[PDB]
């Protein structure tokens, strides 16, 4: 019953092929609802879920202005980071930012977050108290000094505790039917021989929402975690998710192996068996 709203921002320099590419996406839980792409023709923040479409033109015009303003700041940042790390002009670099808030099953604030990465690793992040910063290296300490002098954490806290959770509430209620649903996984296992002495056992979960799920194999009751292949949870394309886990087993021993599925839409965690 727990929820989150998160915004994700990626900017990539392409020196000598123009301005940095900029992409922004917003999600409530695992459902995307807005996007902006610097290279598209529209130059607008655009809807990506039916329930956001009812927002009026002040919403669209405002979010378009704000996201284009985020784009400019990242364009500056790319310059500044090259300087902080004494890096050359002729390599592509990546800045990423994500922020947002979580609320409980009662829709009260749990947690807020605001973090930044450069070239794929942590750069700087607001700590859990929303009053201080974790800086990952010496360059990020320079950002820390500048952000403490500019009282950035206090403006951010006000957003994450107030605004963020107000709008998350609004979205959860406007988007009730799709965001406040739980679709339980439809489960099964497959069996295929890989030779005359071994078989692949694969545990499947289909058509579930939200995306969080655990799938595990046991052999006579003990976890086979180091022998399991577990894929990344993947979108079906229709708003639900899929996941599988597999083990390769000696033929004859199938009935020792069970698959265990935990998901919030199950009344009880399921145990699937070969007998």
């Amino acid at each position: 019953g727990s929820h989150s709203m998160r915004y994700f921002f990626t900017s990539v320099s392409r020196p000598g092929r123009g301005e940095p590419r900029f992409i922004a996406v917003g999600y409530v839980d695992d459902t995307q609802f807005v996007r902006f792409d610097s290279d598209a023709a529209s130059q607008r923040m655009e809807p990506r879920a039916p329930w956001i479409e009812q927002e009026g033109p002040e919403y669209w015009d405002g979010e378009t202005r704000k996201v284009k303003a985020h784009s400019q700041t990242h364009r500056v940042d790319l310059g500044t980071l090259r300087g902080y790390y004494n890096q050359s002009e002729a390599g592509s670099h990546t800045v990423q930012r994500m922020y947002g808030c979580d609320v409980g099953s009662d829709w009260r604030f749990l947690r807020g977050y605001h973090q930044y990465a450069y070239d794929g690793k942590d750069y700087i992040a607001l700590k859990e108290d929303l009053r201080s910063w974790t800086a990952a290296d010496m360059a990020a300490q320079t950002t820390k000094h500048k952000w403490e002098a500019a009282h950035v954490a206090e403006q951010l806290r006000a957003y994450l505790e107030g605004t963020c959770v107000e709008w998350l509430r609004r979205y959860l209620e406007n988007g009730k039917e799709t965001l406040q649903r739980t679709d339980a996984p439809k489960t099964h296992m497959t069996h295929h021989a890989v030779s005359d002495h071994e078989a692949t056992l694969r545990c499947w979960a289909l058509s579930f929402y939200p995306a969080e799920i655990t799938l595990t194999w046991q052999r006579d009751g003990e976890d086979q975690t180091q022998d399991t292949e577990l894929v990344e949870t993947r979108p079906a394309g229709d708003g639900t998710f899929q996941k599988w886990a597999a083990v390769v087993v000696p033929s004859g021993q199938e009935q020792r192996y069970t698959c265990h599925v935990q998901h919030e839409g199950l009344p009880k965690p399921l145990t699937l068996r070969w007998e």
Binding site: K66, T73, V76, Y84, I124, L156, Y159, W167
Partner: peptide, 9 residues
């Protein structure tokens, strides 16, 4: 809704 303009690094 997003936050306002982020402060430069």
């Amino acid at each position: 809704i997003m936050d306002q303009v982020p402060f430069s690094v």
